[PDB]
């Protein structure tokens, strides 16, 4: 048990003293269980009886949930002890584990209780077994208490230092550490490996760390952190999408949770319409009525989850490869693999990063997400097989005002291909009618109008209810598209509307912009020009006076 390991010095937060949380009375039966557990733990050196001078206390409890166990509420001591180097939050991803002929799982028993606790800090762990009479069996810890803030980081650290020696004289045995577990892999003879396991066991037993014997060592399949690890494959654990008549905010959060979890291996998971439902969200209790698109999305997810799927492990010897496919409006899906149909993992990307975007922008963002994830999981970036042609992407990233990093990729011709649905003109169009557009709205009555005046002498005003100056300026552009031929010059004074159209979106949150896009696609040539308002520039002044009167 207790080890000859060096201790970590620990301090309380500056200006803070130890906890003095008084103890609550306990059932005579719980007082008895605590007395026999504490005498067994004092017997092992884990705790020690203390004099009456210790002014600190931490409440102690006993439950059986037979096997009575002692639980200590360290909340107050934790609030008072210094921060530590954050223990491992992220866990390894199954798709980044390197395949190994042999894998062993060691559970370290009573992990925390095997590591000593800084001497100067032990007085602050004091606890008291209650006396029915009130009397008072004061104790204090000599090892890492369970539930204390420092135990995970200090046990972690200690185990790293303990393992260093064996690792050095065994540089061919991979030893993952994670909580009170160790996962040991090797490419040796089941025999050699076993022997090396038994060595590590006895080495760890020399530092007070008990570990499991073959007859007690866990066996594959390994149910670990929501995964299923087989010798040659991995997948996620059973996902049960509930069936309910009514859905609360909380039910939807759990639902997109499980679906986000399933998307790392099940290709084609879509979650966007469902998470659209949680926009203002509010209380997790509010019933949120489902949209038809959220119903279809959920229904397509259940179809996908009907078939079992698995991922493979990593061979640092083979290339890393990523493919991306469009999965509907704004929804994308990707696979990462080394062998053409044996996926390391999958994922999705359905962010608009704005009210409006276009396919090429979203694909580039998808590639970005894949790049970041590849560096996390494998320490490198993959090769990209993408359904877009060089001319499409080169035209976009050259004309795009934002700096972009486009990897080296290979066009894979697998419809739907990513394309530019339209391209605005760069120079005014000869022979095309020139529409001077403007809109206006009353910021109080919310009423408004959109209108044009052209160079052929045509004028028009359409009325609008419940609108804003921004929306009418888009409606004026939409109106000029509606009433023009296949080639049209449009002149607006709206920096707002110009910015939206110049960005060349092909999908939007607003149906008006979606309508404008349909018109832009049906046109052959559109040129959009801008002029400062209220400067008496010809054509612009006529529509202003028109939509103003």
Ligand X SMILES: CCC(=O)n1c(=O)n(CCOc2ccccc2Oc2cccc3cc(C#N)ccc23)c2ccccc21
Within residues 196-225, the interface with other proteins by CB under 8 A covers none
Least distance to other proteins, CB of residue 408, Å: 11
Helix (H) or strand (E) holding 433: strand 433-441
Helix (H) or strand (E) holding 349: strand 342-349
Least distance to other proteins, CB of residue 398, Å: 7
428 binds, among ligand X, Mg ion, other proteins, none (CB under 5 to 8 A by kind): other proteins
Least distance to ligand X, CB of residue 153, Å: 20
* C-beta closer to other proteins: residue 72 or 87: 87
* C-beta closer to ligand X: residue 84 or 222: 222
- 321 is a contact residue toward other proteins (CB under 8 A): no
- Find out whether 473 is annotated in a ligand binding site: yes
The pairing of beta strand 47-49 with beta strand 127-129: unpaired
Helix (H) or strand (E) holding 477: helix 469-482
Give SS3 for 122. helix
Cα–Cα distance between 385 and 379 in angstroms, integer? 19
Least distance to other proteins, CB of residue 132, Å: 40
Residues that bind ligand X (CB under 6 A): 92, 97-100, 103, 105, 174, 176, 183-185, 220, 222, 224, 229, 231, 313
Least distance to other proteins, CB of residue 372, Å: 6
Binding mask 479-498 for Mg ion (x = CB under 5 A): --------------x-----
* C-beta closer to Mg ion: residue 364 or 472: 472
- Find out whether 315 is annotated in a ligand binding site: no
Write the Ramachandran bin of 147: left for phi over 0, alpha for psi from -120 to 50, otherwise beta: left
Residue 82 contacts by C-beta under 8 Å, 6 or more apart in sequence?
10, 11, 12, 13
Within residues 362-401, the interface with other proteins by CB under 8 A covers 365, 368-369, 371-372, 375-381, 397-401
165 binds, among other proteins, ligand X, Mg ion, none (CB under 5 to 8 A by kind): none
157 binds, among Mg ion, ligand X, other proteins, none (CB under 5 to 8 A by kind): other proteins
Least distance to other proteins, CB of residue 318, Å: 15
Q: Are 94 and 233 in contact (CB under 8 A)?
A: no
Beta bridge partners of 248: 287
* C-beta closer to ligand X: residue 232 or 307: 232
Beta strands in 20-129 (DSSP E): 47-49, 60-63, 69-72, 102-107, 127-129
Q: Which of 382, 436, 441, 520 binds other proteins (CB under 8 A)?
A: 436
- Count of beta carbons in the 10 Å neighbourhood of residue 462: 18
183 binds, among Mg ion, other proteins, ligand X, none (CB under 5 to 8 A by kind): ligand X
| Residue of minimal Cβ distance to Mg ion | 493
HSE at residue 361, side-chain half, CA atoms within 13 A, is 19
- 548 is a contact residue toward other proteins (CB under 8 A): no
237 binds, among other proteins, ligand X, Mg ion, none (CB under 5 to 8 A by kind): none
DSSP string, 292-326: HHHHHHHHHHHHHTTS---B--B-TTS--EEEEEE
- 403 is a contact residue toward other proteins (CB under 8 A): yes
438 binds, among Mg ion, ligand X, other proteins, none (CB under 5 to 8 A by kind): Mg ion
Cα–Cα distance between 434 and 430 in angstroms, integer? 10
Q: What phi and psi values does residue 237 have, to the nearest 5 degrees?
A: -80, 165
Within residues 446-465, the interface with other proteins by CB under 8 A covers 453-455, 457
- 541 is a contact residue toward Mg ion (CB under 5 A): no
| Residue of minimal Cβ distance to ligand X | 185
Cα–Cα distance between 139 and 51 in angstroms, integer? 9
Total residue length of the chain: 549
- Find out whether 319 is annotated in a ligand binding site: no
Least distance to other proteins, CB of residue 341, Å: 23
Least distance to ligand X, CB of residue 108, Å: 13
- Find out whether 213 is annotated in a ligand binding site: no
Q: Which of 110, 228, 433, 438 binds Mg ion (CB under 5 A)?
A: 438
* C-beta closer to other proteins: residue 177 or 469: 177
DSSP string, 148-167: -TTHHHHHHHHHHHHHHHHH
HSE at residue 293, side-chain half, CA atoms within 13 A, is 11
**Contacts of the segment 60-69: beta carbons below 8 A, 24+ positions apart:** 60/23, 60/34, 60/127, 60/128, 60/129, 61/26, 61/30, 62/26, 62/30, 62/33, 62/34, 62/37, 63/30, 64/33, 68/33, 68/37, 69/37
Least distance to other proteins, CB of residue 432, Å: 8
- Find out whether 506 is annotated in a ligand binding site: no
* C-beta closer to other proteins: residue 247 or 452: 452
Binding mask 300-319 for other proteins (x = CB under 8 A): --------------------
CA angle, 121 as apex, 118 and 122 as ends, to 5°?
Answer: 90
- Find out whether 365 is annotated in a ligand binding site: no
* C-beta closer to ligand X: residue 79 or 98: 98
- 82 is a contact residue toward other proteins (CB under 8 A): yes
Closest CA to 451 of 431, 472, 420: 472
88 binds, among ligand X, other proteins, Mg ion, none (CB under 5 to 8 A by kind): other proteins
* C-beta closer to Mg ion: residue 323 or 438: 438
What do you get for the CA distance between the two ends of the chain, in Å?
Answer: 90
Closest CA to 547 of 495, 498, 480: 480
* C-beta closer to ligand X: residue 193 or 361: 193
542 binds, among other proteins, ligand X, Mg ion, none (CB under 5 to 8 A by kind): other proteins
- Find out whether 181 is annotated in a ligand binding site: yes
In the annotated binding site for Mg(2+), the residues are: 107, 180-181, 438, 473, 493, 544
Binding residues, by number, are: 107, 180-181, 438, 473, 493, 544
């Amino acid at each position: 048990p207790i080890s000859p390991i060096e201790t970590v010095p620990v301090k309380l937060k500056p200006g803070m003293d130890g906890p003095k949380v008084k103890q609550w009375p306990l059932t005579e039966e719980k007082i008895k269980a605590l007395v026999e557990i504490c005498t067994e733990m004092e017997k092992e050196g884990k705790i020690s009886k203390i004099g009456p001078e210790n002014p600190y206390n931490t409440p102690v409890f006993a439950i059986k949930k037979t096997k009575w166990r002692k639980l200590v509420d360290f909340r107050e001591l934790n609030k008072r002890t210094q921060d530590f180097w954050e223990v491992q939050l992220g866990i390894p991803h199954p798709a980044g584990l390197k395949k190994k002929k042999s894998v062993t799982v060691l559970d370290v028993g009573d992990a925390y209780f095997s590591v000593p606790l800084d001497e100067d800090f032990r007085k602050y762990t004091a606890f008291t077994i209650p006396s029915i009479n009130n009397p008072g069996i004061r104790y204090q810890y000599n090892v890492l208490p369970q539930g204390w803030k420092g135990s995970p980081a200090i046990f972690q650290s200690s185990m790293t230092k303990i393992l260093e020696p064996f690792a050095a004289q065994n540089p061919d045995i991979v030893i993952y550490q994670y909580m009170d577990d160790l996962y040991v892999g090797s490419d040796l003879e089941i025999g050699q490996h076993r022997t090396k396991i038994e060595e590590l066991r006895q080495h760890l037993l020399r530092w007070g760390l008990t570990t499991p014997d073959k007859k007690h060592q866990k066996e594959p399949p390994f149910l670990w952190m929501g995964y299923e690890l087989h010798p040659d494959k991995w997948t996620v654990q059973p996902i049960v999408l509930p069936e309910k008549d009514s859905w609360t905010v909380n039910d939807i959060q759990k639902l997109v949770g499980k679906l986000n979890w399933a998307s790392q291996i099940y290709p084609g998971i879509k979650v966007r319409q469902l998470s659209k439902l949680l926009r203002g969200t509010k209380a997790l209790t509010e019933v949120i009525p489902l949209t038809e698109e959220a119903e279809l999305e959920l229904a397509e997810n259940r179809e996908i989850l009907k078939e079992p799927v698995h991922g493979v492990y990593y061979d640092p010897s083979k290339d890393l490869i990523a493919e991306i496919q469009k999965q509907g409006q704004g929804q994308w899906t990707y696979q990462i693999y080394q062998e053409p149909f044996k996926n390391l993992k999958t994922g999705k990307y359905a962010r608009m990063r704005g009210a409006h975007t276009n396919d090429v922008k979203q694909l580039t963002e998808a590639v970005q997400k894949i790049t970041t994830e590849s560096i996390v999981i494998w320490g490198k970036t993959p090769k990209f097989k993408l359904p877009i042609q060089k001319e499409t992407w080169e035209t976009w990233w050259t004309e795009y005002w934002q700096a972009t990093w486009i990897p080296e990729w290979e066009f894979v011709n697998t419809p739907p291909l990513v394309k530019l649905w339209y391209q605005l003109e760069k120079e005014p169009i000869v022979g095309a009618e020139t529409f001077y557009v403007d809109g206006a709205a009353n910021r109080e009555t919310k009423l408004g109008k959109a209108g044009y005046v052209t160079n052929k002498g045509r004028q028009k005003v359409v009325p609008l209810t419940n609108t804003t100056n921004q929306k009418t300026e888009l409606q004026a552009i939409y109106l000029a598209l509606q009433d023009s031929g296949l080639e049209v010059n449009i002149v607006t004074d709206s920096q707002y509307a110009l910015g939206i159209i110049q960005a060349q979106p092909d999908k939007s949150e607003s149906e008006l912009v979606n309508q404008i896009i349909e018109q832009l696609i049906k046109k052959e040539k559109v040129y959009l020009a801008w002029v400062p308002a209220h400067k008496g520039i010809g054509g612009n002044e006529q529509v202003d006076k028109l939509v103003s009167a």
